[PDB]
Design a protein around this ligand. Structure first.
Ligand SMILES: *[C@@H]1O[C@H](CO)[C@@H](O[C@@H]2O[C@H](CO)[C@@H](O[C@@H]3O[C@H](CO[C@H]4O[C@H](CO[C@H]5O[C@H](CO)[C@@H](O)[C@H](O)[C@@H]5O[C@H]5O[C@H](CO)[C@@H](O)[C@H](O)[C@@H]5O)[C@@H](O)[C@H](O[C@H]5O[C@H](CO)[C@@H](O)[C@H](O)[C@@H]5O)[C@@H]4O)[C@@H](O)[C@H](O[C@H]4O[C@H](CO)[C@@H](O)[C@H](O)[C@@H]4O[C@H]4O[C@H](CO)[C@@H](O)[C@H](O)[C@@H]4O[C@H]4O[C@H](CO)[C@@H](O)[C@H](O)[C@@H]4O)[C@@H]3O)[C@H](O)[C@H]2NC(C)=O)[C@H](O)[C@H]1NC(C)=O
Ligand SMILES: *[C@@H]1O[C@H](CO)[C@@H](O[C@@H]2O[C@H](CO)[C@@H](O)[C@H](O)[C@H]2NC(C)=O)[C@H](O)[C@H]1NC(C)=O
Lengths: 46, 333
């Protein structure tokens, strides 16, 4: 079924995965794009 | 006995990273609450504390067993092994669960996969109080929650008929306010990630008068009548009346400072600082009136003689009028 397919896909992705190595550990740098949604500026103390 | 076998068979081949029906349909979650106490509503930080018993119930076709027992009743030892929705409160400055003595959680897995998950929370929710009409102001400020990572296509919340049920409403720490009602609401918001189903519970608070009535209103009206007392002292005793006026002004400004120090720094004019400003004006006008009286005694005595008795009637009438106007207006507004 769809749940079994998803489970097998995720188990394949996480199997044989090294956390100590960034993506493209030898080649070019990885590009990390940032978004920020400001909820509140709470208090501004002088 | 056999409950261990059931619990072992439910967690064999179970992935707690995949929501139930990951690729079929959104997960319907029924949310209930139990407001223990609505903590102090401090206006300085525009926040308020609330203590609730948050209950979430959903269907999980993977936690479906077939035995004589109908329901499995469990503590917080099996909460971290099944899928649990990531409900967060969108307007909480700081909130935290309870951990003494054992994590305050409850998990009840019925026979057909229906899961009930209950926990105890203390949320310092945020609400920007519009501090006009102070202290004759009423607020209705919410508690909003929604899923964090799952958009509307994956997690849909839905209130029950008898979802939110307040407690006794008597042992709460609502000092300056008074609980008058609540109402639940469901909407859909747009975020950079997707469309989310945001639920809200609006609590209606009405500021009961009292502390301010006896902290600023009475002191200032009593200062006003103290300033009026100078109108009867004979006009020849200058130092007495000058001391009266100037010390009355000093006390008036001190009381205004305190009254404004009660509530936070707001750049608009409230209804309390308006009152203390009118009282300040009254005191200053009584003092400049005596000043002109003393100045005119040297020029024309009969003018000052008539002016004193004129002021003796003109000041209390103008103050009664002001009061009436002010109070009536704000009570109708
Ligand atoms: C930057 O650094 C920061 C500091 O390092 C860091 O903060 C730390 O974050 C981590 C992770 O987020 C925290 O660790 C988790 O804490 C969870 C609860 O945290 C509350 O409690 C701790 C104190 O923890 C004690 O008390 C609880 C409750 O009794 C115990 O469960 C703990 O084991 C622990 O008990 C020991 O200490 C007690 C004395 O206090 C002793 O009496 C006791 O005997 C033990 O010796 C508080 O410090 C927390 O406060 C902080 O966090 C809150 C969060 O809101 C903040 O608001 C606050 O300001 C503080 O910052 C908080 O109050 C633990 O539940 C959790 O452990 C569970 O999860 C992990 C991961 O899933 C599991 O591996 C683990 O096994 C636990 O799961 C078991 O238990 C749960 C119970 O709910 C079961 O549901 C679950 O199924 C599982 O049971 C299974 O396994 C059991 C064995 O593990 C087994 O017994 C069962 O039978 C079953 O098989 C984890 O410890 C850590 O506390 C934070 N520390 C601090 C100082 O904040 C921060 O994240 C970092 N920032 C970033 C960005 O990285
Ligand atoms: C809490 O939410 C429920 C569900 O939206 C509300 O129950 C509805 O109430 C209206 C009028 O009272 C009825 O017409 C609907 O049929 C009810 N729906 C269901 C599913 O029972 C309830 O009113 C809300 N509580 C409030 C606003 O205090």
């Amino acid at each position: 079924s769809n749940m079994s397919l998803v489970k097998e896909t995720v188990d394949r992705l996480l199997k044989g995965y090294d956390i100590r190595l960034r993506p493209d550990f030898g080649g070019p740098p990885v590009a990390v794009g940032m978004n920020i949604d400001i909820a509140s500026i709470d208090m501004v103390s002088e | 006995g056999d409950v261990t076998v059931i619990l072992n068979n439910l967690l064999e081949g179970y992935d707690n990273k995949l929501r139930p029906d990951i690729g079929v349909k959104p997960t319907l979650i029924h949310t209930d609450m139990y407001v223990n106490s609505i903590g102090p509503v401090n206006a300085i930080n525009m926040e308020y504390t609330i203590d609730i018993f948050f209950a979430q119930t959903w269907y999980d076709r993977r936690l479906k067993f077939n035995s004589t027992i109908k329901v499995l009743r469990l503590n917080s030892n099996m909460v971290g092994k099944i899928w649990i929705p990531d409900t967060f409160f969108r307007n909480s400055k700081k909130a935290d669960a309870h951990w003494i003595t054992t994590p305050n959680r409850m998990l009840r897995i019925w026979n057909d996969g229906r899961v009930l998950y209950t926990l105890r929370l203390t949320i310092d929710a945020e609400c920007q109080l519009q501090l006009h009409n102070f202290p004759m102001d009423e607020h209705s400020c919410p508690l909003e929650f929604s899923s964090y990572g799952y958009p509307r296509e994956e997690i849909v919340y839905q209130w029950k008929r008898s979802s939110v049920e307040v407690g006794d409403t008597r042992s709460w720490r609502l000092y300056q306010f008074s609980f008058v009602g609540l109402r639940n609401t469901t909407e859909v918001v747009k975020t950079t990630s997707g469309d989310y189903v945001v639920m809200s519970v609006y609590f209606d608070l009405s500021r009961r008068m009292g502390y301010f009535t006896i902290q600023t209103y009475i002191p200032c009206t009593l200062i006003v009548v103290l300033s009026w007392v100078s109108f009867w002292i004979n006009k020849d005793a200058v130092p007495a009346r000058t001391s009266l006026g100037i010390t009355t002004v000093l006390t008036m400004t001190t009381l205004s400072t305190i009254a404004r120090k009660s509530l936070p720094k707001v750049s608009y004019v409230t209804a309390m600082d308006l009152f203390v400003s009118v009282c300040f004006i009254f005191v200053f006008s009584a003092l400049v009136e005596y000043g002109t009286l003393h100045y005119f005694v040297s020029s024309q005595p009969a003018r000052a003689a008539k002016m004193d008795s004129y002021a003796r009637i003109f000041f209390p009438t103008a103050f009664c009028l002001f009061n009436l106007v002010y109070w009536v207006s704000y009570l109708y507004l």
